[PDB]
Design a protein around this nucleic acid. Sequence first.
DNA 1: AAAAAAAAAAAAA
Length: 460
Amino acid sequence: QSTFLFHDYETFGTHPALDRPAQFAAIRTDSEFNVIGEPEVFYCKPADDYLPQPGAVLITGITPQEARAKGENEAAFAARIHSLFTVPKTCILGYNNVRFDDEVTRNIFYRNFYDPYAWSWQHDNSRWDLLDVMRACYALRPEGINWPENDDGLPSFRLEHLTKANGIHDAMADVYATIAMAKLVKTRQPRLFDYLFTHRNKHKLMALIDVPQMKPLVHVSGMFGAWRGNTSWVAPLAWHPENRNAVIMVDLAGDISPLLELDSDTLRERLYTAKTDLGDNAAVPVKLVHINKCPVLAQANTLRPEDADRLGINRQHCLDNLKILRENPQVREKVVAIFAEATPSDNVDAQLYNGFFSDADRAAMKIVLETEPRNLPALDITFVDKRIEKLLFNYRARNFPGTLDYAEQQRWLEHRRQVFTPEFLQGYADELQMLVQQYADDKEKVALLKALWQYAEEIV
DNA sequence: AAAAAAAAAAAAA
């Protein structure tokens, strides 16, 4: 039986590699989005070598004392999730999960000796993201669903802003809200939904990409902008030379002249230039599309003239530029050359994408999981990848301090001393102070800021 | 099975 697993994290900060999770929530459902089984909710105990981002806490209303009280350790946290995620024929999804939540999962698994990717493909599993779905439905097939406007008068695709606009900040509350919004797009606009669902697989999306012929495609993405209904026509120039999942798209709705005039070396420097300091010179209308990140791509005619007129996209302008691009192969020679160019971090936590782990290293990490916390140091394993030891020490020191001998306790105590420096704690203290002014007339916020300081004391 | 961080806009804590 195929299933849908709607999830959402509530974390202590924006960096999934560097910030710890506070709460996880998830519900199992079926093809028609009907609840299977009971809702899964649990909290993660943050280790004693970390302090949360206050801004992230203020948003959540979840203190470290709460998570520490109600929750379990990150190794168990990583287990309970991996158990739910391993279940075969499961499609794991949420609201903007690919850009964030997934990245958490990957790290959590990476830090706790679980494979960081298997869950997204093994045993007929998959992942999906309902952000660009909502962004598509509005831009292509808006009938039947209400769309917010704000004081700016542009479409807001914030979950809370969508639920309230159609009559519907807790982790579990966000999941339901995600389901309701799925149901809402399914029931009202099922023909689009299914298309977006079946084309979540990069291997499917491939079918749309005819690079030599440069077949124009309808791309929906935030990076375009709300004023364009997050939508435009794009023509694939070429595959990314090093990265295989990336493909180089040229925006047909935009000034192409920079591509013809300026040479690669220039176009590059021009590509990575801020909009502020960029004067009268036009920006390079080129973006990468990452097929493995579930990007919305469809064929031109999916975007109908009337919709292009509603959104404000001069079809003709897109049709012209394509003729010129097809007329100027040298543009492809110029563009690809941009992306063929070649400052890593020391912190093992941040070394996820350094490379895949070998099979041998994999098995050993399966043995590390099997072996009891106390019996790990005795387990004289010969690893190949240098990250695994550093991961293993931190894994033990964070989740099972009781297993540490005096030297390891000293080495850890040093590591904590290197993190919690007087100036870091001063910066944190004044960051906390500032905020307590900024929300001076908010007792709920203050009470938290006091808990952050109280936490910032006792743990060091 | 992957690509963080020049920057594009807008969603996530």
